Structures are given as C-alpha cells and as structure tokens.
Amino acid sequence: KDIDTLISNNALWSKMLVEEDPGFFEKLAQAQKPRFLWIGCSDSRVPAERLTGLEPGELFVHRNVANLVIHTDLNCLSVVQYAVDVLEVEHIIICGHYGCGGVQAAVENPELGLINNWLLHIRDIWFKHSSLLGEMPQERRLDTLCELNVMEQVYNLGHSTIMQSAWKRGQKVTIHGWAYGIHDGLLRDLDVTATNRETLEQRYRHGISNLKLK
Amino acid sequence: KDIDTLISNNALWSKMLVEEDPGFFEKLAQAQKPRFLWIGCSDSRVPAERLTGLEPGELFVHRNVANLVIHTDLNCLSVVQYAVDVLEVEHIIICGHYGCGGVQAAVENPELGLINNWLLHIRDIWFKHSSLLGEMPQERRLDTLCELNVMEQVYNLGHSTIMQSAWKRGQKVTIHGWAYGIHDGLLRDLDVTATNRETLEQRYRHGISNLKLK
Amino acid sequence: KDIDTLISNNALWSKMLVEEDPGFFEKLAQAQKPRFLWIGCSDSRVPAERLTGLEPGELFVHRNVANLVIHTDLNCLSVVQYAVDVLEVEHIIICGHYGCGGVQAAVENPELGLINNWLLHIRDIWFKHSSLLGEMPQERRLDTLCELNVMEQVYNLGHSTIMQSAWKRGQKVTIHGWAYGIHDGLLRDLDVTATNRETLEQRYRHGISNLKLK
Amino acid sequence: KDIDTLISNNALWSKMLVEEDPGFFEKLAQAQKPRFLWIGCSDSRVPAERLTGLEPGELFVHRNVANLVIHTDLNCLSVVQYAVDVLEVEHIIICGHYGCGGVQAAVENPELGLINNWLLHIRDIWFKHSSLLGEMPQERRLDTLCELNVMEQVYNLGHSTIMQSAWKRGQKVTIHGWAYGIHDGLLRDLDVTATNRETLEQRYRHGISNLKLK
Ligand SMILES: [Zn+2]
Ligand SMILES: [Zn+2]
Ligand SMILES: [Zn+2]
Ligand SMILES: [Zn+2]
C-alpha cells in the first residue's frame, strides 16, 4: 500500500462520483456549518464518521494523542473557540477508546522521548484516582483510566474561558464524554454530560462516585 | 442530525455489522501499527479515509485549524514524535483544502477572538509571498495561499528536531504536501515530497518558483 | 517614572560605570556560563539577584505567571532543556512568593480573561489538596497553596523527560523549591530538594505530609 | 558560589535591609501595580532593574530564550494579557541583547535538542531578512539579527488579540523595542515605539527600511 496507490484510489473514487452521484459535491458545496466538534485520539481506530454515521461537513474534528484537553494547549483550545464562537456548534463530544496506546504508555511509562511530557497529564489522573483504581480488580484498571481521562478532559473543557463565557452569554453548547471499544465499536456514554456550570460539576462528581461503586 | 440519532446509528451499525459480517473487529484486534500520519484541517470536509481508501487503523491523524505545523506547538509535535519514533510511520501527509475557512479568515482578518492568534501563522505566510500573490489575479490568491500554507508546514515539519533526527539516523520517512477541493474531491500533489534534508530544501524552492511561473 | 526617565537613568549609569569600574564589563565579557536556573513569578516582587546576592550572568531566568512548570509548556521546557543540556547548570530553583497575585486570583477566580486558562493549573492543585486546605482558616489557605504550587512544579520538573534523561545519564542537577515573604524577604527552603528520580518522590511525599501535620 | 551561600547571603541581607534601608519593605507593602512589563531573554546578562534603575514592584517580567513573542505561545501571551487587562501596565518593552546565545545558535544551527524548535522562530527571521543581511559586512550580521528579532517580536505582540482588543477599547499601552550590549550596558532604542496598530505597522516598515540605508 504505497502512496501512489492512495493517489490512484482517490482518482478512481472521485472519477466515479463525478459521473455517477453528482450529489455529493453539491452537498459539500452547500458548505453547511458543522454542528458537532469531535475531540478524539490520533490512533483513530474507528473513524468518527463511521462510528456515528455522520456525513462529510457535519463534523469538526481535532485529534491529538489520547484525547486531551490541556488547560493551556492553544492548538486544542483554538479548535474549540473557533467551533463555539464562530461555527456555533451545539455539541462537543470528547471520545476516548479502550486499548489506547497513549493511555497505556502513560501507565507503563516507557522512555518514548518527547511524547511522555504530553502523557504526564494522563499520569496526573492515574495518581489522582489511586484509591478508586486500587479498589477495583487489576485487569479493569486501564479501561477505567481511559474513562477517567475522558471525564477529566470534559471537566477541563468546561473550565476553559471559552466555554465558561459561552454558557454565561446564553449560547447553547453541550459537552459529552464517550468511549468506544474495538471488540464491538459500540459507543458507551459516560454520563458526564454538561450544559452549564452546575451540571458540569454535578455530572463530573456523580461520575467519580459511580465509579467508586466497584 | 442531533445527539440521540448518533447513539442509535452506532448501535445499529455495530451490532448489525457483527451479526452479518463480523471478520472486521477481528482484523482491528490485531491492532496493526499505522503506516501513515495524516495532518489535516479540523474542517475535515472530506475525511482522509474516504479520500484515500485507507481503512480504520491504517493512519494516525492530527487535525487543527488549517493544518498547521508550528515550530513550537507541542500538540502537533507530540503526535509527530510518537508517530515517527514509536510507530515508525513511513509517510506524513499534510493536506490542506481549497476554500478552508481558517485560511480565508487569515486574509480577511475579521475579529474572531482567540483563533486569530493561531491564524497569524498563516498571515505570516500571506505577507511572505506578497509579491508572488500580488502578480497573480485577485481571485486566485486564496487557493494559492492554501497551497503555500501546506508547502510551508511541510517545510516546517522537516526542520523540526524530530524529522532532522529521524533522517540523520537513517530512518525512512517521507513527507508530502497535498490539497483537495470540494468540486471533485480530487487530491493534488503539490510536489514537495521529501525524504531527507536536501530534497526538503530543493522541493520547497521549486514549489515556490514553479508557482511564480504559473 | 516614564520611558524618558529610564533611558536617562540607563545613560547616566552606563557612562558612570565605564569611567569608574570597567571591570564590571570585563567580568561579563567572559565565557562564564550560569550555574543556576531560576524559575520565578512574573510579579518579580523582589528580584532574584537581590534576594540571593547573585550577580549578572550567574543565573538563567524564566518567569511566568505564578512560576508554573506545566508538563506541556514548550516555553518553560525550552528554557530548562537549554539550561541543563547546553549551559549545564547545577541547580534549578523554583521560587514562589507569599501574596502572589497569580495564586490569589486562582482561588478567588474572578473573570479575568485569557489568563484564567493558565491559572487552572493552580486550581488543579487547590482541588488536589482539598482536604488539607479545607481544614484551615480562609486567611492561611493562600500561603499554603503558594508552597503547594512550588512543590508541585518541582515535581513536574523532576518528571519531565529533560530532567529524567539528565538524571539517568548521570549529570549533576539539583532542583529546589523556595518561597519568600514580603515582610522580610526571607527565603524559606520548602525542603523538596531533588538530586535524582528517587529523592524526588521521597522529598515530595515528605513535603505534603509534613504540611498536613501542621 | 554555593546553595548555602545563597541562603546566608539572603539571611544577612534581610536584616541589613529590615532597618538599614528601612523604606524597602515599606514601599513593597503597598502592593502597587507595576507600570511596565519587561519581556527579555533568560540570559538576563544585565538585569532590567540595574539597567533602567527600576525598583522592585515597578515592572512585571517575562523571560524566555531569546526574548520571543510567538503568535501561539500561551506562556508569554498569558503574562501579556494579565499585565494589560488586569494590571493595566502602560508600557511593554521587549529588550534583546547583542551576543545572545539564543540568536547565535539560531544562525549556526548546532544540534542542541529540544530548544532548536524554539530557535526556529529566529531562523525564520534570519532567512526573511536574507538580502538585508547579505548587503552588510558579515561581522555585523549577528547584531543586526538580534535587533530584527526584537522588531519582529514587537510586530507579533502588537498583532496579538490581546493587544488589538486593548487598543480598540482605548486603553493606553505603548510597546517598545530595545537592545543592549555587554560592552557598556547602554540601552539602544530601535525606534519601533507604537501606541496602536497603525503606528505599529508604520514603525515596523521604517524599522526595516532604515537598517537598509545604514
Ligand atoms: Zn488512542
Ligand atoms: Zn480548513
Ligand atoms: Zn507572583
Ligand atoms: Zn539571550
């Protein structure tokens, strides 16, 4: 699967749509504004279009390593602010995935070079929930960290100035934390949904105690 | 399409796939290492997987507003480092797209807030090629800027410590600059493909100088 | 004191010192690399040279709001990698200060604009130590947070790939965590001094537990 | 010097000041907002206090390697936004210095590791002003680069959203670009002083033009 193969597939796929479904390229030319912002991992095990049955132009996307929303990452923060203040999306979905190489490397902590600084933020979370994790069986720990990561990133995004001041002026925006597994591509909703300052907090706290129950 | 319709489509898609033709989840479980890193725009007008016929898991993906590789952006540089040092991808494709809202905002320069700062890196490019751009009919400057911007991020990518150090140690990594439009989804190779320090410079230079003809 | 006056203070002072102490500049013209790196706050309540009696060129300096060492801030990590890998400093001091405007604004959390995102890193610490902080009076929480901040930034610095690879190639580098008051200018060693991976973890746990005693 | 010798230097100084220059902690007790924000290099060869005679509490300070203001460095833009919006400083001075190790490395491009990424922002400037620099004696090129660096950082600072929305809402803020050398400590004004976006641009254009005639 060389590069010249990608060029040639694209050419066959485009040449077939031009003549056979003129549809497509008009839907895109409709240039309709996105309504969701997907914040996912660069592993991109199962593309978000495939996972949700969303069409091109309906998803705004950011992908870094391990779905993080770092308080001071201007790259991710810039995606969010464009999305919210300019594109006026209504839904921001942060979605992790069980078996994430990033999450796993955060715990095993191999010497991988520069990436380990990025992965320190996920380690912060593993130690933050030491007790919660030490109480559940050794074999369900990684998956749970993957879930906590996503809860924490939802927490962070809600505390961003972008989101706090978007809610405060009345604009409708809803954050969601999800995860999918690769055994079945099924999206599990983590029930940490937020539409203002209050739910954000409630749902996050509820989210941590719901985990303490195992 | 609102949030209840995405949770439903996914359960239909999943389970529907598993019961009639399940050998897909098998192949994913093997978690084979991706060979391409795709750095694209958050707009994602046409997803990379649909452009190229790359399957799930065949590509690492980063997306930010206007597919930028900023010298000092630890987000994109972490993706790139992980992909190169740890996953050992052979190809990095930076793909821009004609009509990008980022690229347009960069030139029109409306008051958008936080995002404008990120966009200054594109504005830098606009003024860098003010002569080239000025000797060209007004109506072509946006599409030209779009290519110029990809050419510059590729150039940026190969100058990073990560790429300089992969090439020097003999690792095989090739960097590409592409762009597509929405009228036909057809990929154009902007022809700045680089496999070492030397071709990086020569390709960049001819990339610019062959625009100055056209 | 407007600009006109800073230029004249500087002119007078330069003229004066060229007539009456040319050695001042003879000392500075030398290949003498700094021995210490100072990470302090942009408040710069009492400068570092006057706290310690350190002289021109004996220290490398970084200052940001609340003297943070964020896992993924390339600004501060660039200053560190340069100091350690290139200038080969032997001591890194992170110094906070009681009354720090940055810390105070973290807790009181006014709507200050863009800076609030920077400060969420301190709020993380305010909530990490929610119990210890919660069981003291309101007035004393600000000074404890200040020392807690300094301890947590030493921790982060110790965990950074730069310190990690430095310590394991057997380079001599000591991290310190200090704080000064503005009733004295007296430097309290917060007693988290780290020479290696091992002392780093010990001293950090020592630090937090010894605070929780009082 | 030694770490014990920094603590006792300090201890000594803290009594020989508490009632011998008694009006030091009298001044700082009044936690008065600085009027100046100084953005300088981590080299800090001659401190800003000693150069200008500015007293403790009168300046806010940011230092990074080679005194940069990157469009998307949140560390430096955070200091700036807090300085301007919260502290309401009237003056921001970016000061570079001749013989800056950061500028020199940018040109000569040794492999120093992580810092090279940061210095690529200076390499861009080196190349941006290729003709200017080539039309001068080679011996003069590093000094001119150091100055062009300050000018370009000033340009960046004035184009950030923090500065644009401060000048649009009538707040009085003046940006200046200075440099000094170690041979006499004498500040040199590079004359890019701007109080709004219109003079920012004019001042930059003539900054570059007057170098060309010289
Ligand atoms: Zn992942
Ligand atoms: Zn775009
Ligand atoms: Zn402070
Ligand atoms: Zn310097």
PDB file of N, CA, C and O in Angstrom, chain A residues 96-147:
ATOM      1  N   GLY A  96     -12.849   8.936  23.943  1.00  0.00           N
ATOM      2  CA  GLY A  96     -11.682   8.064  24.065  1.00  0.00           C
ATOM      3  C   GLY A  96     -11.982   6.669  23.544  1.00  0.00           C
ATOM      4  O   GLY A  96     -13.059   6.448  22.987  1.00  0.00           O
ATOM      5  N   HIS A  97     -11.028   5.748  23.699  1.00  0.00           N
ATOM      6  CA  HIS A  97     -11.149   4.377  23.185  1.00  0.00           C
ATOM      7  C   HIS A  97     -10.279   3.387  23.960  1.00  0.00           C
ATOM      8  O   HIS A  97      -9.063   3.613  24.101  1.00  0.00           O
ATOM      9  N   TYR A  98     -10.906   2.288  24.421  1.00  0.00           N
ATOM     10  CA  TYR A  98     -10.254   1.237  25.244  1.00  0.00           C
ATOM     11  C   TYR A  98      -9.111   0.621  24.474  1.00  0.00           C
ATOM     12  O   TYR A  98      -9.249   0.330  23.306  1.00  0.00           O
ATOM     13  N   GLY A  99      -7.969   0.462  25.129  1.00  0.00           N
ATOM     14  CA  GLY A  99      -6.755  -0.029  24.486  1.00  0.00           C
ATOM     15  C   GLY A  99      -5.857   1.066  23.896  1.00  0.00           C
ATOM     16  O   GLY A  99      -4.879   0.743  23.193  1.00  0.00           O
ATOM     17  N   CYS A 100      -6.163   2.338  24.191  1.00  0.00           N
ATOM     18  CA  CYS A 100      -5.368   3.466  23.691  1.00  0.00           C
ATOM     19  C   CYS A 100      -3.866   3.320  23.989  1.00  0.00           C
ATOM     20  O   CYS A 100      -3.482   3.123  25.119  1.00  0.00           O
ATOM     21  N   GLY A 101      -3.028   3.388  22.954  1.00  0.00           N
ATOM     22  CA  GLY A 101      -1.592   3.250  23.107  1.00  0.00           C
ATOM     23  C   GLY A 101      -1.088   4.344  24.010  1.00  0.00           C
ATOM     24  O   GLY A 101      -0.240   4.108  24.868  1.00  0.00           O
ATOM     25  N   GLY A 102      -1.645   5.540  23.837  1.00  0.00           N
ATOM     26  CA  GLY A 102      -1.331   6.676  24.679  1.00  0.00           C
ATOM     27  C   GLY A 102      -1.624   6.463  26.155  1.00  0.00           C
ATOM     28  O   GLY A 102      -0.765   6.735  27.001  1.00  0.00           O
ATOM     29  N   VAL A 103      -2.827   5.991  26.471  1.00  0.00           N
ATOM     30  CA  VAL A 103      -3.209   5.786  27.860  1.00  0.00           C
ATOM     31  C   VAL A 103      -2.341   4.701  28.492  1.00  0.00           C
ATOM     32  O   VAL A 103      -1.873   4.836  29.626  1.00  0.00           O
ATOM     33  N   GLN A 104      -2.124   3.639  27.729  1.00  0.00           N
ATOM     34  CA  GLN A 104      -1.331   2.509  28.167  1.00  0.00           C
ATOM     35  C   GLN A 104       0.100   2.936  28.466  1.00  0.00           C
ATOM     36  O   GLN A 104       0.624   2.613  29.524  1.00  0.00           O
ATOM     37  N   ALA A 105       0.712   3.686  27.550  1.00  0.00           N
ATOM     38  CA  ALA A 105       2.074   4.225  27.754  1.00  0.00           C
ATOM     39  C   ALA A 105       2.155   5.186  28.941  1.00  0.00           C
ATOM     40  O   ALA A 105       3.182   5.282  29.591  1.00  0.00           O
ATOM     41  N   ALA A 106       1.068   5.875  29.247  1.00  0.00           N
ATOM     42  CA  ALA A 106       1.048   6.742  30.417  1.00  0.00           C
ATOM     43  C   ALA A 106       1.272   5.949  31.713  1.00  0.00           C
ATOM     44  O   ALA A 106       1.927   6.441  32.630  1.00  0.00           O
ATOM     45  N   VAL A 107       0.764   4.716  31.774  1.00  0.00           N
ATOM     46  CA  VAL A 107       0.847   3.866  32.976  1.00  0.00           C
ATOM     47  C   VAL A 107       2.121   3.002  33.042  1.00  0.00           C
ATOM     48  O   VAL A 107       2.798   2.952  34.080  1.00  0.00           O
ATOM     49  N   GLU A 108       2.428   2.316  31.944  1.00  0.00           N
ATOM     50  CA  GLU A 108       3.647   1.516  31.814  1.00  0.00           C
ATOM     51  C   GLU A 108       4.851   2.423  31.952  1.00  0.00           C
ATOM     52  O   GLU A 108       5.871   2.028  32.510  1.00  0.00           O
ATOM     53  N   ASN A 109       4.704   3.640  31.420  1.00  0.00           N
ATOM     54  CA  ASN A 109       5.720   4.678  31.431  1.00  0.00           C
ATOM     55  C   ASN A 109       7.043   4.288  30.831  1.00  0.00           C
ATOM     56  O   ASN A 109       8.082   4.367  31.484  1.00  0.00           O
ATOM     57  N   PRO A 110       7.015   3.880  29.575  1.00  0.00           N
ATOM     58  CA  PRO A 110       8.258   3.666  28.835  1.00  0.00           C
ATOM     59  C   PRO A 110       8.907   4.997  28.434  1.00  0.00           C
ATOM     60  O   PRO A 110       8.215   6.018  28.411  1.00  0.00           O
ATOM     61  N   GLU A 111      10.220   4.951  28.177  1.00  0.00           N
ATOM     62  CA  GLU A 111      11.003   6.091  27.707  1.00  0.00           C
ATOM     63  C   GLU A 111      10.864   6.224  26.204  1.00  0.00           C
ATOM     64  O   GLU A 111      11.658   5.651  25.452  1.00  0.00           O
ATOM     65  N   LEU A 112       9.875   7.006  25.792  1.00  0.00           N
ATOM     66  CA  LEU A 112       9.454   7.106  24.412  1.00  0.00           C
ATOM     67  C   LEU A 112       9.947   8.419  23.781  1.00  0.00           C
ATOM     68  O   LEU A 112       9.735   8.659  22.569  1.00  0.00           O
ATOM     69  N   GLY A 113      10.604   9.253  24.597  1.00  0.00           N
ATOM     70  CA  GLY A 113      11.011  10.590  24.201  1.00  0.00           C
ATOM     71  C   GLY A 113       9.936  11.632  24.527  1.00  0.00           C
ATOM     72  O   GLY A 113       9.175  11.496  25.514  1.00  0.00           O
ATOM     73  N   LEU A 114       9.857  12.623  23.635  1.00  0.00           N
ATOM     74  CA  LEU A 114       9.070  13.831  23.790  1.00  0.00           C
ATOM     75  C   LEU A 114       7.580  13.610  24.115  1.00  0.00           C
ATOM     76  O   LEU A 114       6.966  14.395  24.837  1.00  0.00           O
ATOM     77  N   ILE A 115       6.993  12.564  23.566  1.00  0.00           N
ATOM     78  CA  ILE A 115       5.599  12.237  23.851  1.00  0.00           C
ATOM     79  C   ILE A 115       5.298  12.066  25.364  1.00  0.00           C
ATOM     80  O   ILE A 115       4.182  12.321  25.787  1.00  0.00           O
ATOM     81  N   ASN A 116       6.280  11.689  26.191  1.00  0.00           N
ATOM     82  CA  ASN A 116       5.995  11.421  27.610  1.00  0.00           C
ATOM     83  C   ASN A 116       5.613  12.644  28.424  1.00  0.00           C
ATOM     84  O   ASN A 116       4.946  12.516  29.455  1.00  0.00           O
ATOM     85  N   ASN A 117       6.017  13.823  27.946  1.00  0.00           N
ATOM     86  CA  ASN A 117       5.552  15.087  28.521  1.00  0.00           C
ATOM     87  C   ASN A 117       4.051  15.235  28.282  1.00  0.00           C
ATOM     88  O   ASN A 117       3.295  15.536  29.200  1.00  0.00           O
ATOM     89  N   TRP A 118       3.591  14.952  27.072  1.00  0.00           N
ATOM     90  CA  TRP A 118       2.159  15.028  26.789  1.00  0.00           C
ATOM     91  C   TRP A 118       1.418  14.012  27.676  1.00  0.00           C
ATOM     92  O   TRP A 118       0.411  14.330  28.302  1.00  0.00           O
ATOM     93  N   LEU A 119       1.973  12.815  27.763  1.00  0.00           N
ATOM     94  CA  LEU A 119       1.387  11.736  28.553  1.00  0.00           C
ATOM     95  C   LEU A 119       1.445  11.945  30.103  1.00  0.00           C
ATOM     96  O   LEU A 119       0.806  11.215  30.852  1.00  0.00           O
ATOM     97  N   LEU A 120       2.217  12.929  30.573  1.00  0.00           N
ATOM     98  CA  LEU A 120       2.262  13.269  32.003  1.00  0.00           C
ATOM     99  C   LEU A 120       0.885  13.706  32.505  1.00  0.00           C
ATOM    100  O   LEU A 120       0.507  13.423  33.626  1.00  0.00           O
ATOM    101  N   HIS A 121       0.134  14.384  31.656  1.00  0.00           N
ATOM    102  CA  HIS A 121      -1.194  14.819  32.016  1.00  0.00           C
ATOM    103  C   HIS A 121      -2.126  13.628  32.302  1.00  0.00           C
ATOM    104  O   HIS A 121      -2.972  13.711  33.189  1.00  0.00           O
ATOM    105  N   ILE A 122      -1.981  12.525  31.571  1.00  0.00           N
ATOM    106  CA  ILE A 122      -2.787  11.343  31.848  1.00  0.00           C
ATOM    107  C   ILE A 122      -2.269  10.660  33.118  1.00  0.00           C
ATOM    108  O   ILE A 122      -3.050  10.196  33.899  1.00  0.00           O
ATOM    109  N   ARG A 123      -0.961  10.587  33.330  1.00  0.00           N
ATOM    110  CA  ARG A 123      -0.428  10.137  34.614  1.00  0.00           C
ATOM    111  C   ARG A 123      -0.959  10.914  35.822  1.00  0.00           C
ATOM    112  O   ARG A 123      -1.190  10.332  36.849  1.00  0.00           O
ATOM    113  N   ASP A 124      -1.146  12.219  35.702  1.00  0.00           N
ATOM    114  CA  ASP A 124      -1.675  13.039  36.794  1.00  0.00           C
ATOM    115  C   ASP A 124      -2.997  12.474  37.294  1.00  0.00           C
ATOM    116  O   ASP A 124      -3.347  12.616  38.474  1.00  0.00           O
ATOM    117  N   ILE A 125      -3.728  11.879  36.365  1.00  0.00           N
ATOM    118  CA  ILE A 125      -5.077  11.396  36.576  1.00  0.00           C
ATOM    119  C   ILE A 125      -5.071   9.991  37.217  1.00  0.00           C
ATOM    120  O   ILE A 125      -5.856   9.713  38.128  1.00  0.00           O
ATOM    121  N   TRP A 126      -4.183   9.127  36.730  1.00  0.00           N
ATOM    122  CA  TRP A 126      -3.919   7.837  37.335  1.00  0.00           C
ATOM    123  C   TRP A 126      -3.548   7.939  38.850  1.00  0.00           C
ATOM    124  O   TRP A 126      -4.021   7.130  39.654  1.00  0.00           O
ATOM    125  N   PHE A 127      -2.740   8.928  39.239  1.00  0.00           N
ATOM    126  CA  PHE A 127      -2.375   9.109  40.645  1.00  0.00           C
ATOM    127  C   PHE A 127      -3.488   9.821  41.421  1.00  0.00           C
ATOM    128  O   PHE A 127      -3.631   9.656  42.633  1.00  0.00           O
ATOM    129  N   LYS A 128      -4.272  10.611  40.710  1.00  0.00           N
ATOM    130  CA  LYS A 128      -5.349  11.370  41.316  1.00  0.00           C
ATOM    131  C   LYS A 128      -6.418  10.419  41.790  1.00  0.00           C
ATOM    132  O   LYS A 128      -7.072  10.696  42.772  1.00  0.00           O
ATOM    133  N   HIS A 129      -6.578   9.305  41.087  1.00  0.00           N
ATOM    134  CA  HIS A 129      -7.559   8.294  41.422  1.00  0.00           C
ATOM    135  C   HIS A 129      -6.909   6.953  41.852  1.00  0.00           C
ATOM    136  O   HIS A 129      -7.470   5.889  41.605  1.00  0.00           O
ATOM    137  N   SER A 130      -5.728   7.034  42.473  1.00  0.00           N
ATOM    138  CA  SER A 130      -5.032   5.914  43.128  1.00  0.00           C
ATOM    139  C   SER A 130      -5.921   4.907  43.908  1.00  0.00           C
ATOM    140  O   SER A 130      -5.823   3.682  43.727  1.00  0.00           O
ATOM    141  N   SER A 131      -6.721   5.458  44.825  1.00  0.00           N
ATOM    142  CA  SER A 131      -7.606   4.688  45.675  1.00  0.00           C
ATOM    143  C   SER A 131      -8.752   4.094  44.859  1.00  0.00           C
ATOM    144  O   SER A 131      -8.977   2.882  44.903  1.00  0.00           O
ATOM    145  N   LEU A 132      -9.467   4.935  44.111  1.00  0.00           N
ATOM    146  CA  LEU A 132     -10.557   4.460  43.246  1.00  0.00           C
ATOM    147  C   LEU A 132     -10.098   3.311  42.352  1.00  0.00           C
ATOM    148  O   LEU A 132     -10.849   2.342  42.138  1.00  0.00           O
ATOM    149  N   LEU A 133      -8.864   3.406  41.854  1.00  0.00           N
ATOM    150  CA  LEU A 133      -8.307   2.382  40.968  1.00  0.00           C
ATOM    151  C   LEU A 133      -7.759   1.176  41.717  1.00  0.00           C
ATOM    152  O   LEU A 133      -7.831   0.074  41.204  1.00  0.00           O
ATOM    153  N   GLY A 134      -7.200   1.387  42.906  1.00  0.00           N
ATOM    154  CA  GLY A 134      -6.610   0.309  43.692  1.00  0.00           C
ATOM    155  C   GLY A 134      -7.647  -0.637  44.297  1.00  0.00           C
ATOM    156  O   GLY A 134      -7.296  -1.718  44.766  1.00  0.00           O
ATOM    157  N   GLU A 135      -8.917  -0.211  44.273  1.00  0.00           N
ATOM    158  CA  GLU A 135     -10.052  -0.937  44.839  1.00  0.00           C
ATOM    159  C   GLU A 135     -10.755  -1.825  43.816  1.00  0.00           C
ATOM    160  O   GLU A 135     -11.464  -2.787  44.188  1.00  0.00           O
ATOM    161  N   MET A 136     -10.597  -1.507  42.534  1.00  0.00           N
ATOM    162  CA  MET A 136     -11.156  -2.368  41.507  1.00  0.00           C
ATOM    163  C   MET A 136     -10.092  -3.321  40.977  1.00  0.00           C
ATOM    164  O   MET A 136      -8.900  -3.024  41.053  1.00  0.00           O
ATOM    165  N   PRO A 137     -10.523  -4.485  40.487  1.00  0.00           N
ATOM    166  CA  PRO A 137      -9.599  -5.530  40.018  1.00  0.00           C
ATOM    167  C   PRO A 137      -8.515  -5.047  39.034  1.00  0.00           C
ATOM    168  O   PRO A 137      -8.795  -4.253  38.127  1.00  0.00           O
ATOM    169  N   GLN A 138      -7.296  -5.559  39.216  1.00  0.00           N
ATOM    170  CA  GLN A 138      -6.126  -5.193  38.398  1.00  0.00           C
ATOM    171  C   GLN A 138      -6.355  -5.152  36.873  1.00  0.00           C
ATOM    172  O   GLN A 138      -5.669  -4.415  36.169  1.00  0.00           O
ATOM    173  N   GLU A 139      -7.317  -5.932  36.380  1.00  0.00           N
ATOM    174  CA  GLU A 139      -7.498  -6.178  34.944  1.00  0.00           C
ATOM    175  C   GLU A 139      -8.474  -5.191  34.345  1.00  0.00           C
ATOM    176  O   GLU A 139      -8.601  -5.125  33.133  1.00  0.00           O
ATOM    177  N   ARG A 140      -9.197  -4.452  35.187  1.00  0.00           N
ATOM    178  CA  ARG A 140     -10.136  -3.427  34.702  1.00  0.00           C
ATOM    179  C   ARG A 140      -9.609  -1.991  34.905  1.00  0.00           C
ATOM    180  O   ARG A 140     -10.318  -1.023  34.646  1.00  0.00           O
ATOM    181  N   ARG A 141      -8.351  -1.868  35.321  1.00  0.00           N
ATOM    182  CA  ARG A 141      -7.754  -0.568  35.638  1.00  0.00           C
ATOM    183  C   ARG A 141      -7.506   0.327  34.410  1.00  0.00           C
ATOM    184  O   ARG A 141      -7.807   1.507  34.448  1.00  0.00           O
ATOM    185  N   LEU A 142      -6.958  -0.238  33.337  1.00  0.00           N
ATOM    186  CA  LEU A 142      -6.634   0.545  32.151  1.00  0.00           C
ATOM    187  C   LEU A 142      -7.866   1.149  31.530  1.00  0.00           C
ATOM    188  O   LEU A 142      -7.894   2.338  31.219  1.00  0.00           O
ATOM    189  N   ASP A 143      -8.881   0.318  31.356  1.00  0.00           N
ATOM    190  CA  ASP A 143     -10.150   0.745  30.787  1.00  0.00           C
ATOM    191  C   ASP A 143     -10.768   1.864  31.596  1.00  0.00           C
ATOM    192  O   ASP A 143     -11.363   2.780  31.038  1.00  0.00           O
ATOM    193  N   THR A 144     -10.626   1.783  32.911  1.00  0.00           N
ATOM    194  CA  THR A 144     -11.232   2.754  33.792  1.00  0.00           C
ATOM    195  C   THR A 144     -10.461   4.088  33.712  1.00  0.00           C
ATOM    196  O   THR A 144     -11.059   5.161  33.695  1.00  0.00           O
ATOM    197  N   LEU A 145      -9.137   4.007  33.622  1.00  0.00           N
ATOM    198  CA  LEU A 145      -8.303   5.192  33.432  1.00  0.00           C
ATOM    199  C   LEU A 145      -8.689   5.851  32.130  1.00  0.00           C
ATOM    200  O   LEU A 145      -8.832   7.076  32.075  1.00  0.00           O
ATOM    201  N   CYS A 146      -8.879   5.041  31.090  1.00  0.00           N
ATOM    202  CA  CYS A 146      -9.351   5.560  29.816  1.00  0.00           C
ATOM    203  C   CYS A 146     -10.650   6.343  30.019  1.00  0.00           C
ATOM    204  O   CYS A 146     -10.763   7.448  29.494  1.00  0.00           O
ATOM    205  N   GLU A 147     -11.595   5.810  30.811  1.00  0.00           N
ATOM    206  CA  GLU A 147     -12.849   6.534  31.120  1.00  0.00           C
ATOM    207  C   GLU A 147     -12.615   7.810  31.953  1.00  0.00           C
ATOM    208  O   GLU A 147     -13.184   8.855  31.646  1.00  0.00           O
TER     209      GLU A 147
END
